[PDB]
Design a protein around this ligand. Structure first.
Ligand SMILES: *[C@@H]1O[C@H](CO)[C@@H](O[C@@H]2O[C@H](CO)[C@@H](O)[C@H](O)[C@H]2NC(C)=O)[C@H](O)[C@H]1NC(C)=O
Ligand SMILES: *[C@@H]1O[C@H](CO)[C@@H](O[C@@H]2O[C@H](CO)[C@@H](O)[C@H](O)[C@H]2NC(C)=O)[C@H](O)[C@H]1NC(C)=O
Lengths: 299, 302
């Protein structure tokens, strides 16, 4: 009817006392036993005439706090998982017989938490429908088991696993999988584990490689007849970054003289009614090759 | 792991002893408790320094046989149903703690058995399809429950009922029903009750009243022209027995001189070619009236 909880390593005080000592009634012995289901083992004994007795596996771990005809309260020190059980405290008395009480000792263990990414190089790819492992969250050897979950704006799938260890602790593992995408890059993925009203949180930032997404800037609403010295710039979003930039027009040739320094496209001084046209930058990176465009107006 | 059985009123010995008394290990106190599946009430205590104590109950019903540091054996006397339960015998010791053993005490009760027939007078009737109670077999307040059955060549139905009393005993009742018939009369129907390998048996003989069933004997394959002094005799099977026997022919009149002394139909001396005919006996009893017949032949050669 009464429960005690304590963490591995800590000390708990197990109370036991005799309700209504009466002059006639003589307490012979006080005995703590522990029940592991169906089975009693002896723990500690206090006998007024004979003293105290602690049994292995309690050798240096139990003492009576105030041994007495009516108080058998003990302290159990340096809790270990093996201490879980039901503790019976029993007063042997004359002439009235035995009188006992019970209490449940539950031993708890705080888990060990961490997150870790794949060794694999996350790589987005057209036609790949395949979900890939990207992070693993572990809450190890906790008791009771912790609860694992994810906090991310990513839209991947999580699988969860519990391993009940023989000692009674439980390791909780979650594997986070997704289909790698441009948008997933540099996104944060946070594993979470609430244990005993603590909330632990540990983050990753995903590194996803992707084919270049090309844009061309430097264009202005108005471009004169004979405006000066105007540039175009090819901003290509890629990971890893793009290593080559090649220019062309929609009509084949780059109108001499429009000079290309890579990923910059300079027009010298005079502009005219020629230089009308689609312009294209072709970016390349380890993943990819792709292009962008500009319609250029001059009046 | 260890079970004791005793009957109500008798005594059992609940053995308890401490295996390996050691100089090291001091027995402080010896205690019997009677666990009632959840609770725990003290029974008797033996303390070497202080003596013996029987809590009450069972003030005059328990004693340690040979109270001792290492023998806690008690006798529980004049057993009662309330004594059922699990008995824990526990040795309190220093420095080694408690040492206990358990045994199950099952208290048994011998049932009371009997049979009793209906007080109604059983009466057969044509067209009555209805099964009627004819005997009740009771095995009362037994524990464990006995097993009731019937031993009869009668063809009736038995219903069985079990009543669990609050004290834990069990009454078994069996009701034996049949449709009363001529054939059921004087048939024996005893009830059987098996308990603790005893076989109890108690019998009834049915008394079924019925309308007469008439037979006519004394007719012989051959009856001469002019054979002597031949009788017809009307045996009427009835219960209670028939009190009246009335004769007639199928053609009305009795050929004089054929004399009727009741339930005998005497033909004096000479027989002839007359005296041919169907003859009928009409029996009557409190239940009934019914008749029988004979077709009578008379010719020359036998
Ligand atoms: C419960 O048992 C587990 C399983 O053995 C213990 O966890 C192991 O601890 C040691 C180091 O402390 C490692 O060598 C193992 O690899 C650990 N983990 C696993 C999954 O095997 C754990 O210590 C026990 N829990 C306690 C004592 O709280
Ligand atoms: C168990 O309960 C029954 C039911 O009352 C007891 O049987 C009765 O005994 C008394 C005499 O002591 C009779 O007058 C009753 O008529 C009995 N039978 C019934 C069916 O009522 C029986 O004694 C109890 N068994 C015990 C105490 O062992």
């Amino acid at each position: 009817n009464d429960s005690m909880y304590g963490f591995i390593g800590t000390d708990v005080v197990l109370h036991c006392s005799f309700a209504n000592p009466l002059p006639s009634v003589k307490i012979t012995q006080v005995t703590w036993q522990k029940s592991t289901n169906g089975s009693k083992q002896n723990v500690a004994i206090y006998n007024p005439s004979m003293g105290v007795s602690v049994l292995a596996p309690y050798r240096e771990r139990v003492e009576f706090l105030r041994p007495s005809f009516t108080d058998g309260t003990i302290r159990l020190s340096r809790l270990e998982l093996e201490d879980e059980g039901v503790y019976i405290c029993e007063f042997a008395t004359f002439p009235t017989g035995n009188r006992e009480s019970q209490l449940n000792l539950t031993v708890m263990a705080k888990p060990t938490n961490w997150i870790e990414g794949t060794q694999a190089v996350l790589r987005a790819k057209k036609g790949q429908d395949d979900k890939v492992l990207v992070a693993t969250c572990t809450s190890a050897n906790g008791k009771p088991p912790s609860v694992v979950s994810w906090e991310t704006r990513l839209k991947g799938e999580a699988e969860y696993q519990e391993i009940r260890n023989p000692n009674g602790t439980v390791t909780v593992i979650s594997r986070y999988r997704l289909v790698p995408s441009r948008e997933a890059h540099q996104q944060s993925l946070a594993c979470i584990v609430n244990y005993h009203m603590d909330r632990f949180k540990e983050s990753l930032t995903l590194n996803v490689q992707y084919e270049p997404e090309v844009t061309i800037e430097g264009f202005d609403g108005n471009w004169y007849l004979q405006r000066m010295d105007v540039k175009l710039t090819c901003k290509a979003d890629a990971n890893p970054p793009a290593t080559e930039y090649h220019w062309t027009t929609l009509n084949g040739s780059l109108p001499k003289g429009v000079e290309a320094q890579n990923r910059t496209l300079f027009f010298k001084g005079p502009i005219n009614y020629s230089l009308a046209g689609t312009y294209i930058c072709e970016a390349t990176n380890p993943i990819g090759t792709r292009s962008g465009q500009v319609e250029v107006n001059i009046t």
